[PDB]
Design a protein around this ligand. Structure first.
Ligand SMILES: *[C@@H]1O[C@H](CO)[C@@H](O[C@@H]2O[C@H](CO)[C@@H](O[C@@H]3O[C@H](CO[C@H]4O[C@H](CO)[C@@H](O)[C@H](O[C@H]5O[C@H](CO)[C@@H](O)[C@H](O)[C@@H]5O[C@H]5O[C@H](CO)[C@@H](O)[C@H](O)[C@@H]5O)[C@@H]4O)[C@@H](O)[C@H](O[C@H]4O[C@H](CO)[C@@H](O)[C@H](O)[C@@H]4O[C@@H]4O[C@H](CO)[C@@H](O)[C@H](O)[C@H]4NC(C)=O)[C@@H]3O)[C@H](O)[C@H]2NC(C)=O)[C@H](O)[C@H]1NC(C)=O
Ligand SMILES: *[C@@H]1O[C@H](CO)[C@@H](O[C@@H]2O[C@H](CO)[C@@H](O)[C@H](O)[C@H]2NC(C)=O)[C@H](O)[C@H]1NC(C)=O
Ligand SMILES: *[C@@H]1O[C@H](CO)[C@@H](O)[C@H](O)[C@H]1NC(C)=O
Ligand SMILES: *[C@@H]1O[C@H](CO)[C@@H](O)[C@H](O)[C@H]1NC(C)=O
Lengths: 49, 44
């Protein structure tokens, strides 16, 4: 199943070291957040949800 | 009395009073011709 949990199941071979977004704001990056992957542009915002 | 149809007499205005009243009752999105790309970059 895809996208039904806030955490994921991952094969060990797919794991990578964490990186920060602080020096990569407002530019297109590839992301992998707790198993959810994609491309996008990130900006600091007031918290909602 | 033709006041409502005339442009009032800083930078000069470009709308009469009645034109102002009409435009204020219509909701139109701003396309941002000058710098809309950066404004959208300021996401919210
Ligand atoms: C020969 O022809 C040329 C071409 O026609 C003539 O040149 C034009 O002359 C006029 C008059 O001098 C110039 O107008 C000024 O332009 C300023 C710059 O505007 C740009 O930047 C703005 C942000 O900084 C931006 O908002 C603006 O774009 C919005 O507005 C335009 C219309 O003006 C729309 O087409 C855009 O889509 C956009 O609209 C959105 O925002 C609007 C405003 O909220 C909404 O109404 C709209 O629905 C949209 O949501 C553009 O990119 C601009 O700053 C100047 O603004 C002042 O004057 C106008 C008109 O009186 C007021 O309405 C403003 O509020 C503001 O007022 C006061 O001005 C004085 C003096 O600057 C200032 O001291 C005071 O503090 C201001 N205070 C207030 C109350 O706000 C003004 O619009 C125009 O740019 C020229 N075009 C060029 C050079 O290409 C030329 O004169 C002709 N020659 C002869 C001899 O006739
Ligand atoms: C012509 O009509 C306009 C309205 O269409 C009059 O202007 C208004 O007058 C009232 C009362 O002084 C003000 O509160 C409004 O703000 C005015 N509206 C404007 C200036 O757009 C105007 O006084 C009339 N002229 C005469 C001489 O009858
Ligand atoms: C990832 O982090 C671990 C623990 O700090 C470290 O041992 C490893 O070398 C890091 N890998 C890379 C490629 O930097
Ligand atoms: C992001 O915004 C929040 C809330 O406005 C602020 O407290 C925080 O410090 C900002 N982050 C950075 C890295 O400046």
């Amino acid at each position: 199943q895809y996208g039904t949990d806030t955490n994921s199941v991952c094969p060990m071979q797919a794991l990578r070291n964490d990186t920060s977004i602080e020096d990569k704001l407002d530019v297109c990056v590839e992301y992998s957040l707790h198993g959810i992957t994609g491309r996008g542009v990130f900006h600091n915002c007031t918290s909602v949800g | 009395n033709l006041t409502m149809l005339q442009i009032p007499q800083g930078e000069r205005k470009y709308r009469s009073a009645i034109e102002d009243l009409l435009f204020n009752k219509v909701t139109i999105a701003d396309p941002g011709y000058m710098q809309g790309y950066d404004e959208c970059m300021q996401q919210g």
